[PDB]
Amino acid sequence: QGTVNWSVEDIVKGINSNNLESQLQATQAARKLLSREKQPPIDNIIRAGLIPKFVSFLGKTDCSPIQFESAWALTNIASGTSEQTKAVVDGGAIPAFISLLASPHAHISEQAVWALGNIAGDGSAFRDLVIKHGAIDPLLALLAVPDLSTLACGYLRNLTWTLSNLCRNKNPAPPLDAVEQILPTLVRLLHHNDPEVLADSCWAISYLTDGPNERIEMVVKKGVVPQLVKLLGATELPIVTPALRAIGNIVTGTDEQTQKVIDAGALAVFPSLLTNPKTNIQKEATWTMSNITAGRQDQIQQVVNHGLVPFLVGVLSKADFKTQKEAAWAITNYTSGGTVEQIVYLVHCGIIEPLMNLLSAKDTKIIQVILDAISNIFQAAEKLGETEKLSIMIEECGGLDKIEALQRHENESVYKASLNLIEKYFS
């Protein structure tokens, strides 16, 4: 009735009055433009000079309503482009929002957490500035209760989201000492039964395990892999997605880190992941399988044992093309590091036909990966005195018509590997 749909000039007139109630009503008016318009005029607000007036309102402890309205307006400006977030930061907002974390009003401390999450969420430099101003200690103090379930749901969701933005981004990664302060609380949110807190917790763990193997070790050492694998089997796709990403990041690390996810039973979920209706899940699960078949021979054997090779044959036969490209990598790694027996098993599962169908792809990376696999399969045929059998299989399915052509190919790596498979086998 009163503060609905003012113009910016009226907002300025109100904020500039020497009347705290008039400042209050024009702030609430600004907040409603910024929360109720799709396409809010963030830029006009900034150009009017209002950010530093809102930042000074954060400090009016005497008037908790204008604290809230300005905290809400600043949250929404900081949710915009990086130039918009920067205007909020340049206005002095970080330390003001950090003091508001101590507020006795929950709705105000919650809004301060939400604003700091938008600021941290902009990128590495603002993430690291928030840490430097000391946000971590009072953020974690807000979770220092015996049972998390006594906290309001939206409140705990906002905190988890902000903590996860403090773990996010990678040129550079968050300081080690920040990560070590945050990890124990993150392990605890990972056992909290609310799907949105579990989702954002797994995203946090996924950001922290992307990077060098030393970062992975610090997560894996906290003992979280079995809880991650349990979230991997959830029915909520927004949980399964970052749980899979975090697991996938872990198998890019050392053979010992890889074995922790095998030991926790991750491979039993892969039948469902590899046939998942959501193509992004299939893509990532196949990426993750490709890093497992880059493992040791005894890790290759566990993929075999769990019945997964037929699934990789299936995904190479019929998947979205980027999923097939990952299955191609999984095959090359398996054939480059597997025993001869493992490799015979692969051929017995029907690998040859779909491997050959992919040689008609117009993408040069995959063609090299596949020729690489052919040559590894042949080497194990060499070791067996069965190169005869193998060439017939390839000729019999259309392999030879395809490999011939790649002699006449506009890429050095391609025509060399193929004109050589011909010169050595076809013959």
């Binding site: 929360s35 109720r36 809400w72 949250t75 929404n76 900081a78 949710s79 915009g80 977030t85 809004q111 939400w114 999450g117 938008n118 969420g121 902009d122 989201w161 996860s164 933005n165 996010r168 989702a199 954002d200 995203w203 970052p242």
Partner: peptide, 9 residues
Amino acid sequence: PFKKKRREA
């Protein structure tokens, strides 16, 4: 997960 979240409506 959207890096930045508006508080809407």
